[PDB]
Amino acid sequence: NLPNIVILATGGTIAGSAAANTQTTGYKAGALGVETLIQAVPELKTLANIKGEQVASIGSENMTSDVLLTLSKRVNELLARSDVDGVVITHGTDTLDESPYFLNLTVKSDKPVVFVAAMRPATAISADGPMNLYGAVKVAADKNSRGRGVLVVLNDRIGSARFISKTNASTLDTFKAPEEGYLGVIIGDKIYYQTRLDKVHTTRSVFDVTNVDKLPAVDIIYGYQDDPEYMYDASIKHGVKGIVYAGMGAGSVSKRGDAGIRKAESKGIVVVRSSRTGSGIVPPDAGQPGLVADSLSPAKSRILLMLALTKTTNPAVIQDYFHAY
Amino acid sequence: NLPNIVILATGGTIAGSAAANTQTTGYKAGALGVETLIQAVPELKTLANIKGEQVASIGSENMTSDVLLTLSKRVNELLARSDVDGVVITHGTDTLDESPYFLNLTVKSDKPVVFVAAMRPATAISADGPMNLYGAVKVAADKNSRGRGVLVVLNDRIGSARFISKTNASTLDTFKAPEEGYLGVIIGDKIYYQTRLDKVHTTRSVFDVTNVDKLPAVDIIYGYQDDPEYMYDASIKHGVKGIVYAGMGAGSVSKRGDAGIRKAESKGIVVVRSSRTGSGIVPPDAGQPGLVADSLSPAKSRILLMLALTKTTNPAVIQDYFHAY
Amino acid sequence: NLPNIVILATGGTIAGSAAANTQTTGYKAGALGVETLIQAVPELKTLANIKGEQVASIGSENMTSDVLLTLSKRVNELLARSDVDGVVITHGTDTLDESPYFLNLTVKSDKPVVFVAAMRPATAISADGPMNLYGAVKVAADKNSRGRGVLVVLNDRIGSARFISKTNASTLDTFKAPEEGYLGVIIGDKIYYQTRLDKVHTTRSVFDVTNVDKLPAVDIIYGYQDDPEYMYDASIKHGVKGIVYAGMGAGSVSKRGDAGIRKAESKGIVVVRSSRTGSGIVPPDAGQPGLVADSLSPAKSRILLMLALTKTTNPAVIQDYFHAY
Amino acid sequence: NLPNIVILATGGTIAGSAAANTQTTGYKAGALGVETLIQAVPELKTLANIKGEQVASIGSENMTSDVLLTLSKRVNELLARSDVDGVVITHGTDTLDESPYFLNLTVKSDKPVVFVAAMRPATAISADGPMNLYGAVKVAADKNSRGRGVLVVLNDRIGSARFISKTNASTLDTFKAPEEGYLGVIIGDKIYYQTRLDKVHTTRSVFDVTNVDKLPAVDIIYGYQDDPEYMYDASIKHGVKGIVYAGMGAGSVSKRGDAGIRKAESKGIVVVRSSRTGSGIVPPDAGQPGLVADSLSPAKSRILLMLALTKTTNPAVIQDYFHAY
Ligand SMILES: N[C@@H](CC(=O)O)C(=O)O
Ligand SMILES: N[C@@H](CC(=O)O)C(=O)O
Ligand SMILES: N[C@@H](CC(=O)O)C(=O)O
Ligand SMILES: N[C@@H](CC(=O)O)C(=O)O
Secondary structure, rough: OOOEEEEEEOOOOEEEEEEOOOOOOOOEEEEEOHHHHHHHHHHHOOOOOOOOEEEEOHEEEEEEHHHHHHHHHHHHHOOOOOOEEEEEEOOOOOOOOOHHHHHHHHHOOOEEEEOOOOOOOOOOOOOHHHHHHHHHHHHHHHHHHHOOOOOEEEEEEEOOOOOEEEEOOOOOOEEOOOOOOOOOOEOOOOOEEEEEOOOOHHHHHHOOOOOOOOOOOOEEEEEEOOOOOHHHHHHHHHHEEEEEEEEEEOOOOOOHHHHHHHHOOOOOEEEEEEEEEEOEOOOOOOOOOOOOOOOHHHHHHHHHHHHHHOOOOOOOHHHHHHHHH | OOOEEEEOOOOOHHHHHOOOOOOOOOOOOOOOHHHHHHHHHHHHHHHEEEEEEEOOOHHHHHHOHHHHHHHHHHHHHOOOOOOOEEEEEEEOOOOOOHHHHHHHHHHHHHHHOOEEEOOOOOOOOOOOHHHHHHHHHHHHHHHOOOOOEEEEEEEOEEEOOOOOOEEEEEOOOOEEEOOOOOOOEEEEOOOEEOOEOOOOHHHHHOOOOOOOOOOOOOOEEOOOOOOOOOHHHHHHHOOOOOEEEEEEEOOOHHHHHHHHHHHHHHHOOOEEEOOOOOOOOOOOOOOOEEEEEEEOOHHHHHHHHHHHHOOOOOHHHHHHHHHHH | OOOEEEEEEEHHHEEEEOOOOOOOOOOOEEEOOOOHHHHHHHHHHHOOOEEEEEEEOOOHOOHHHHHHHHHHHHHHHHHOOOOOOEEEEOOOOOOOOOHHHHHHHOOOOOOOEEEEOOOOOOOOOOOHHHHHHHHHHHHHOOOHHHHOOOOEEOOEEEEOOOOEEEOOOOOOEEEEEEOOOOOOOOOOOOOOOOOOOOOOOHOOOOOOOOOOOOOOEEEEEOOOOOOOHHHHHHHHHHHOOOEEEEEEEEOOHHHHHHHHHHHHHOOOOOEEEEEEOOOOOOOOOOOOOEEEEEEEOOHHHHHHHHHHHOOOOHHHHHHHHHHOO | OEEEEEEEEOOOOOOOOHHHHHOOOOOOOOOOOOHHHHHHHHHHOOOEEEEEEEEEOOHHOOOOOOHHHHHHHHHHHHHHHOOOEEEEEEEEOOOOOOHHHHHHHHHOOOOOOEEEEEOOOOOOOOHHHHHHHHHHHHEEEOOHHOOOOOOEEOOEEEOOOOOOOOOOOOOOEEEOOOOOOEEEEEOOOOOEEEEOOOOHHHHHOOOOOOOOOOOOOEEEEOOOOOOOOOOHHHHHOOOOOOEEEEEEEOOOOOOHHHHHHHHOOOOOOEEEEOOOOOOOOOOOOOOOOOEEEEEOOHHHHHHHHHOOOOOOOOHHHHHHHHHHO
């Protein structure tokens, strides 16, 4: 009796197709279904009983919070069933920073939720998709993968949704977390778990979007030399509920950024100072406005802020989420 | 006789002072003069004859293109003299991604221009400033450091202005370049050069800002899920000459980002697609609008685009600069 | 009432002194007592009630298994007392791969055992010792640091004794674990735990050396092109109980290395195939002799094998230790 | 017309064939000829005119100095011809630390010598071989690859033979150089060179093996706690010409290692102190015996020492080679 795994497809280059096998970038992309991905890897039949389901068919650069609501609700419906042991989600790499972390806070089950992607299309020479999908299903079918939070599997690595991000624009090994490493690795058709996420996730999370139809809008504004104050004005004008600041260094604000953040806060907008660096802690500073993002990236900080605004508008409670989640 | 090195001060945590040494973050920053930094390390006298100038006294988060013009003009004025062998620039870490790369394209000399910074204030326990400054002066005083482009010295490393960036928000070893490494290292009071910059820099650069009073305005717009098109509308309204897109993955645009970029291009604004990932190549794509940033980060792409706009607005010529510089 | 922390000194460059402050390497090293290190950082009094003890005064390159036995028995006696909350151990960096992992398997307490070291002597410019010691004591005094296994603190990082190793010969940031990251970080006088060790350690470990006078001899033989078979003959002649093979790639043996290992196994010597690469999994292979080291480095594999030989010689039980510890 | 590239096969997992595609490790390895590798990638015909030769059919773990001597002589006579523009060498990954660096010092031409390997067998799911081979041939056929030293191409990276090493036992992205990065990358069917090797290589190298029948024997002895002195006695007994010490930290010797090295030096054996860390500089120290390996790893130090012993035994001259090569 093999485990029962459901593969939910949302699109991405993993389900992409090009005219030539030498083409990995800059091509008229064609989408493939979940059944085509399953049929491409007949070795999945030794791991688990597989059922395919197409949630979406878009590039992750076009992934929206509305589709994330639909995805999370469907994952929760499936994991509540006794005939589903785990869920594998085929997704694009461009916003694989956000999607798994969204599910890390919204999934109400200990059963494995494994995001999977590919940097090369299925038609490409040495396409990474087939092995990544094999690894993802293997992880989801393993009972030892439970209670570890949402997992992300690419290039023989098992990364945490809380730390893993696309660190390189175009390489196969792009998904890394320099300061936190990987939760596990897949070597020689065997899973080796090494670390556990020391943050609040899945079953112990207070965030629930089961009865949420629309999430609060949150913008991300970059921090740099000569950064305009008018970007904050644009966010205020359109009435966003939150703003994540991709700050210079440890979330440092310029005179124009400081003025823009305080103007947003006076209108009731919750601002969180993250970092454009790529990793590390943004420490508390009473001399600067806004909350701090802890070690959360601008992309993941936005996700947490959106979900935090569904529960509260209290800055201290939201700050507590950033240090715990 | 010893070489003649001039230390130009712009500010930063390297010249920062706190009431307690346990404080490294969120403190009352006390700005120190260039002479105080020189007197703190009397071992600089064994390396070279030191002179100090105070170009600026601000945090790098407030570093502007106007101050960079003043800095670049002063560096070129000093390096043209026979009594100056090299220059050391004490700067902050928050925008040390931009400043050195600016001078990497504007300095008209093979003489060493070495940027130096510190993550911990001078008062802090195990302050990195003193050793960083010693290493920077040592690098600038070495004649073998010539013709290598603008250098950045922190944590015993010599990084290229073209590749090095603050990769972590709060650590001493934050300045890294995972795909390109370091040009050299400083170990045991000795310099070990290992790699050379294979890009156009300094003397061979066509970018000259000697007769430039004001640089063209360039904004950076971040790429993420549900990214607003109105950010581009804000840039267009304020009449920016360039827009750098910190794209999802390999500079991928959403439907709103695509619309915002094409709207900017119709107004004559040159848009360059960079990446929010942290490293890697953004490959050319005819299916997407805007130019491609090659391996240049959003911060450095903005610097190059700003300087490219002083000479031309032609997309093909600017694209050529992005692959060469 | 502040926690009671005991600082045990074994030596190292953290307690080293040079002729000049520009000397970090190649000098006549002097020794500093445990009290000299404590008085150098008066900020330790705000963290905990400190009591220093001098266990040894040697370079870690000369650290032996006999001294580790004495250290482990002493730590166990200290932590068994109700008036001790944690222990900080000043040690050298050269064999900081072995020592903490030894205590990770032998210390029977949830109370923090924090190893600390320095890459620069206390006399050097921007000596890392003072801050590393401050960070180590802060970790040991924190109640949240309990039950996390043996910790290693340098350069604002909290690494696991199971994963952390000296990855660079001479840099301050040398202690890394690319595949596993850090358990926590120390930023802005605050501790941020991110991951937990998912292996058997400390309290749950079966390795008890309280009644052990002398440990079994284990050698490490390197794997390379034209590697001699006579090195294995030298180990067999001296009657070692174990041999760790620092293998090429994934612990691959040459024809001479295969012959040497099989000859050792016939004499009752338990051989474990590790890797010279620096990281990763050495997978099981029925076509090759010896056991596999999992992700354990040659240095750490020797430590585990040495402790495993005090309990059993059964290859199946020892292999189970390598996948669980 | 297209360039003329010769592919020299030595063996390895790139030419490996397993029973099942889920088998990447621990399998009965099969041997695939050079023509089988060429016919597997028909896209090589668009890059260059290909001719294949079978130099060897062994795993790199069994690669010997006599085969490297034969390989180097064959590469040199091929590059001397006008009908050969570059050479691609299919090799194993286990000793890809040594082989390319050997040729980096022995090749007497600016024509590209590109080593290529694969972590997964040709039969495996998402086998890296085909893309790596395509990338290697593309690099060898590119005129811009000339005068850059021996290149190593895997996972879309172009690494220098001087710096690149297998850093992980079992992953696709194993070939890294933390402190030096890559010379270039292959993204979207385009080569992007970023750094150049700032060491003496190929054409300018003084190490000629045209008239060498047998290379001097050089052993590598590992440095660790309780390291035996008898390993050095075994090397002296068999009359090796050199000994590379894989030292603890920055090549630090124990009391037994110090006694063993000085005993080797008294018998005329040249000893070089390298590091077991994985990267970094081993600094000169008059207080310790033996020469220093600079930034060279134990594997690469052995290669340089072996080639230096064909010319001289003078300690100061060999030490100079270690800082220049
Ligand atoms: N544009 C693609 C990139 C990828 O999947 O690799 C996506 O994110 O859907
Ligand atoms: N806020 C400081 C940060 C630093 O220098 O470390 C600056 O950039 O000026
Ligand atoms: N030789 C020293 C190196 C250090 O501590 O940095 C030791 O390990 O004791
Ligand atoms: N055992 C193989 C490993 C590989 O090529 O991946 C070899 O080096 O030949």
